[PDB]
Structure 1
């Protein structure tokens, strides 16, 4: 079924859920802290679920990848080898910034948010500041009880606001990862593709302090005891079976203006794809020379590969469904249905005119802004800018500090400085600085007008780039102890430093704050125009009998449907892959190099009690017509009785354009079968202690 439904829309989908084959009462799904919705957790960018009363959490391999990478070395490469913790004391810290978010409360605060915004009057900057102040005040009251973290969400262009309250678990530990040849079987070749043969799962455990409250990593912390956890399905999942997913999809753009789509399609996607492919080649080469570079950059390399391929896929999808034409036709239909509405349709019409006007601004600057933005987010330089910015915000009252630099953010900023120790090699950062400066100096003189960067380059040729990178090479911010000292320093200490990266951060900061003010002004202009126009598109969609649900915004959504394949001319993709399909893709070369224990077990047909007689094998991955996107990785797939049948992890090639224009015919979720998760942990990369904790043997 189409739609990323908010829990508040359960009454609207209760009928369709039952019709598709849900056997729980839809009222059971409305209890978001009860069984089974309360077992579903957010990780920040990924979804997961509790699967034991001792706080075992299951997610995707590609979601645990960062945690596995932080715990890898060139000699003891867990990304390659996998990992198991036979006892609680063997479990590895997933890193200081790993989180498990357990939902406590959702509060509708629409009337209060709109009243704060209207109270600002006509000043766009005051409007942006009023919503910021309202956001901070709501979150401060909601976070007064220790161990809770709150977030304000904006839905449907700012027509609805809800405050989420979560228990914020801060001590997350790695329990199990299959080898990378299972967790990431077929690598970037099979990424965004069906048929798929990927064992994309891994396990964490949530810990709390001995007092029961969230705490950073400590030896005397103890497993979290969740109220609810999911059980693995006893009923075999088959073709046509009902499935549903609860999770935290990140961002969709289905309510984008036609010109927002056109800019993304003609500039953003092809440009990012081109540069990311070129940076990835540089990182791959550096990794072949030094396995420490390969391990330190592995999370960055996987993320960048996934984004570049996704973008190429969206561009192919747009041509497949003529997204440009569908956008143009819908925008024309809305603007005509408004006109026929008389005076009542004039505000929305004028909101549209204001948003249309906002687009033009980001032409002629957009290549400069990309290169300078990427240069400033290289490791040493980005740490310098963050650290200098924090020293400035520290001197203000907490309520007046920029979102991201308040007291409630200090442990996250510190965590980032710590995690950089496992993700930084000076010789690799130098090559990334060179790459983005080289793009900047290759711009036309009118466009390469960043005055501070022009002063530091003092040239526009290869010699000038090399010269600036040589100077910045004198930085001490590669040192963890140096970063942690700067984290505590006042703004005068930064302004007196002769560290070249710190000098650079001090030089660029005035122009960074001015650019922030311009953004906040544009934000304040959208806070009145975007809701009026997006409400009109929704009203028009409702008048046309179309499904109305908000674009994804990192909050909890429900999607449902059935196990099923899809087709193109001369091809029908069947809903399951099987063990024999993994072995048929074997080449013995990364990324089609399965463990010997897997190839041996498939050759012997060791199906370990997990064979589905309908398939004649153990299923590996499956397709269904659910509506997921980035953020839904690791979402539990529940059957008709709310039992776990698999994890969401990817979409088929033709699905990725559904970010902009939903296509029901070729949009499928790719999930890993819970039976393959069990088979890997039984026959290939054993976790007997885990199968026991899951009551699976």
Structure 2
């Protein structure tokens, strides 16, 4: 079924849920801290779920990838080898910034948020500061009890605001990862593709301090005891079976203006894909010369591969469904429908005209902004900018500090500085600085108008770039101890440093704060125009009997449907893959290089009690017509009785353009079957302690 339904829309999908095959009462799904919705957790960018009473959490391999990479070395490469912890004491810290968010409360605060915005009058910067202040005040009251973290969410262009309260677990440990050749079978070749044969799962465990409250990693921390956890399905999942997903989709753009779509299609997507593909070649080459580079950059290389391929898929999809035609026609129908409404429709029409004006702002600054943006986000420079920015915010009262630099963010900033030790090599950073500066100096002189960067380059050719990278090479911010000292330093110490990375951050900061102020002005203008126009689009959609649900915004959503394949001319994709399809793809070369114990077990038909007689094998991956996006990775797929039948991890090639224009015919979720996850842990990469904990052995 189409839709990323908010829990508050359960009454509207209760009948469709039952019709599709839900055997739980839709009522049971509305208790978001009960069984089973209470077992679903956010990781920050991925979904996961509790699967034991001792705080075992299951998610995708690609969601645990960062944690696995932080614990990998060139010599002991867990990404390649996998990992198992036989006992609690063998579990590895997932890193200081790993989180498990357990939902405690959702509050509707729409009327209060709208009153705070209106309270600001017709000044856009005051409107942006009013919502900021409201957001900070809600979050401070909601976080007064130790161990909670809150977040204010804007829905439907700012027509609805809800405050989420979560227990924030800060001690997350790695328990199990299959080998990379299972976890990421087919690599970037099979990424965004069906047929699919990827065992995309791993396990964490949540820990708390001995006092029961969240704590950073410590030896005497103990496993979290969740109130609810999911059970692995005892009923074999088959074609046409009801499935549903609860998770944290990040961002969809189905309500974007035609011009926002056109800009993304004609500039953002092709341009990011081009540059990311070129940076990836550079990282791949450096990785072949030094395995330390390969391991330290593995998470970046993985994310950049995923985005670049997703973008190429979205562009193909737009042509497939004529997304440009469909956006143009819908926007024309909404503006014509408003007109026929007379008086009542003039506000939305004026809100449209205003958003329409916001587009053109980036035309001959978009290339510059990209290159300067990427240069400033390289590791040493970005660390210098964050550290200098924090030194400025610390001089203010906490309620006046920029979101991201308040007291409640300090441990996350510090964790980032710590995680950079596992993700930084000077010789690779210099190549990244060189790459983005090179693109900058190749712009026409009109567009290369970053005056600070112009001063530090003192040229617009290869030698000027080499000279600046040589200069920035003298930085000490590669040192973890140096970064942790700067983390506590006052503004004056930054301003006195002869560290060239720090000098660069001090020099660019005034222009950065002015660019941020301009952003907040544009935000404040949108805080009134966006909701008016998006409410009209939603009203129009309801007039046309179309499904109305908010764009994803990193909050909890439910999607449902059935196990089913899809088709193109000449082809029908079947809803399951099987073990034989894994062995049929074997080449012995990355990324089609399965463990020997897998190839041996498939050749012997060792199905380990998990064969589905309807398939004649153990199922590997399955297709369903659910509505997921980035952020849904690791979401539990629940059957009609709320049991775990698999994890969401990807979509088929034709699904990716549904970020902009949903296509029900060729949009499918790809999930890993809970039976394959059990089969891998039995036959290939043994986890006997985990199968016991899951009551599967």
Quote the offset at 1:255 in angstroms.
0.1
**Per-residue deviation, residues 363-406 of structure 1 (Å, max 9, x unmatched):** 11000000000000000000000000000000000000000000
C-alpha displacement at 1:272, in angstroms?
0.1
Alpha-carbon separation, structure 1, partners of 2:628 and 2:347: 33
> CA–CA distance in 2 between the matches of 1:245 and 1:687?
26
Distance 2:236 2:139 in 1: 44
- Post-superposition shift, 1:641? 0.1
Report the Cα distance in structure 1 between the residues aligned to 2:4 and 2:482, rounded to whole angstroms: 45
Listed one character per residue, the Cα deviations across residues 91-114 of structure 1 (whole Å, up to 9, x for unaligned) are 000000000000000000000000
Determine the structure 1 residue equivalent to 2:520.
Answer: 520
Q: CA deviation at 1:360?
A: 0.3
**TM-aligned CA deviation for residue 200 of structure 1:** 0.2
Shift of residue 163, structure 1, vs aligned partner: 0.1
Structure 1 residue 432, shift from structure 2 partner? 0.0
Deviations 1:558-601 (A, max 9, x none): 00000000000000000000000000000000000000000000
**TM-score, length-scaled by structure 2:** 1.00
- The alpha carbon displacement at 1:628 in A equals 0.1
The Cα of 1:689 is off from its aligned counterpart by 0.1
- Report the 3-state secondary structure (helix = DSSP H, G, I; strand = E; otherwise coil) of the residue aligned with 1:692: helix
The superposition leaves residues 663-684 of structure 1 with CA deviations (integer Å, 9 ceiling, x where unpaired) of 0000000000000000000000
SS of the residue corresponding to residue 477 of structure 1 reads: coil
Q: How far does residue 551 in structure 1 lie from its aligned partner after superposition?
A: 0.1
Question: Per-residue deviation at 1:557?
Answer: 0.0
Cα distance in 2 for residues equivalent to 1:522 and 1:187: 40
Q: Deviations over 1:528-548 (max 9, x none)?
A: 000000000000000000000
SS of the residue aligned with 2:404?
Answer: coil
Deviation per CA, 1:182-211: give whole Å up to 9, x if none: 000000000000000000000000000000
Alpha-carbon distance in 1 for matches of 2:658, 2:262: 15
Q: Is the partner of 1:131 in helix, strand or coil?
A: helix
4+ residue stretches of structure 1 with deviation over 3 A?
none
Deviations 1:647-678 (A, max 9, x none): 00000000000000000000000000000000
Deviation at 1:43, TM superposition (A): 0.0
Q: Secondary structure at the match of 1:326?
A: helix
CA positional deviation for 1:143 = 0.0
Residue 612 of structure 2 corresponds to 612
Tell me the equivalent position of 2:99: 99
Q: Deviations over 1:496-518 (max 9, x none)?
A: 00000000000000000000000
CA drift of 1:55 comes to 0.1
Residue number in structure 2 paired with 1:4: 4
3-state SS in 2 of match to 1:103? strand
Alpha-carbon separation, structure 1, partners of 2:596 and 2:469: 46
Q: Within 2, Cα distance between the matches of 1:468 and 1:311?
A: 32
Residue 405 of structure 2: SS of its match in structure 1? coil
1:213, CA displacement in angstroms? 0.1
Deviations 1:145-191 (A, max 9, x none): 00000000000000000000000000000000000000000000000
1:428-453 Cα distance to aligned partner (Å, 9 max, x none): 00000000000000000000000000
Alignment deviations for residues 31-74 of structure 1 (CA, whole Å, 9 cap, x no partner): 00000000000000000000000000000000000000000000
Structure 1 residue 336, shift from structure 2 partner: 0.2
Q: Tell me what 2:591 maps to.
A: 591
SS at match of 1:163: strand
Q: Distance in 2 between matches of 1:493 and 1:450?
A: 25
Note the 1:439-518 alignment, pairs <5 A. Answer: 439-518=439-518
Unmatched runs of 5 consecutive residues or more in structure 1 = none
Aligned-partner Cα distance in 2 for 1:695–1:136:
44
Task: Give the Cα separation in 1 of the matches to 2:572 and 2:262.
Answer: 32
Cα distance in 2, alignment partners of residues 443 and 640 from structure 1: 57
Distance (Å, rounded) in 2 between the aligned partners of 1:496 and 1:110:
46
Aligned to 1:230: 230
In the aligned structure 2, how far is the partner of 1:4 from the partner of 1:179?
Answer: 32
| Cα-to-partner distance string for 1:333-387 (whole Å, 9 max, x where unaligned) | 0000000001100000000000000000011100000000000000000000000
User: Structure 1 residue 638: deviation in Å?
Assistant: 0.1
Q: CA deviation at 1:307?
A: 0.1
Match of 1:545 in 2: 545
How far apart, in 1, do the equivalents of 2:255 and 2:130 lie?
A: 25
Please state how far the C-alpha of 1:232 moved relative to its aligned partner: 0.1
- Mapped to 2, the partners of 1:99 and 1:155 lie a distance apart of 24
The separation in 2 between residues aligned to 1:601 and 1:215, in whole angstroms, is: 42
1:675 and 1:363 map into 2 onto residues whose CA distance is 51
Q: 1:409: Cα distance to partner?
A: 0.1
SS in 2 for 1:421: helix
* Cα-to-partner distance string for 1:291-350 (whole Å, 9 max, x where unaligned): 000000000000000000000000000000000000000000000000000110000000
Tell me the distance in 2 between the aligned counterparts of 1:360 and 1:282.
Answer: 33
| 3-state SS in 2 of match to 1:363 | coil
Tell me the distance in 1 between the aligned counterparts of 2:65 and 2:624: 25
Report the Cα distance in structure 2 between the residues aligned to 1:563 and 1:227, rounded to whole angstroms: 30
How many Å separate the matches in 2 of 1:604 and 1:330? 56
Q: Give the Cα separation in 1 of the matches to 2:493 and 2:35.
A: 53
C-alpha distance in structure 2 between counterparts of 1:262 and 1:603, whole Å: 50
Aligned partner of residue 502 in structure 2, secondary structure = helix
Partner secondary structure for residue 367 of structure 1: helix
* Deviation, structure 1 residue 269: 0.1
- In 1, the alpha carbon distance for the partners of 2:515 and 2:83 equals 45
Taking the aligned partners of 1:305 and 1:695, their CA distance within structure 2 comes to: 37
SS of corresponding position for 1:19: helix
Distance (Å, rounded) in 2 between the aligned partners of 1:325 and 1:607: 49
Q: Deviations over 1:408-443 (max 9, x none)?
A: 000000000000000000000000000000000000
Deviation digits for residues 435-488 of structure 1 (CA, Å, limit 9, x no counterpart): 000000000000000000000000000000000000000000000000000000
RMSD: 0.1
Structure 1: distance between partners of 2:289 and 2:687: 34
Q: Which secondary structure state, in structure 2, belongs to the residue aligned with residue 263 of structure 1?
A: helix
Q: Match for residue 435 of structure 1?
A: 435
* C-alpha distance in structure 1 between counterparts of 2:591 and 2:622, whole Å: 20
SS at match of 1:553: coil
Distance in 2 between residues matched to 1:104 and 1:671, nearest whole Å: 27
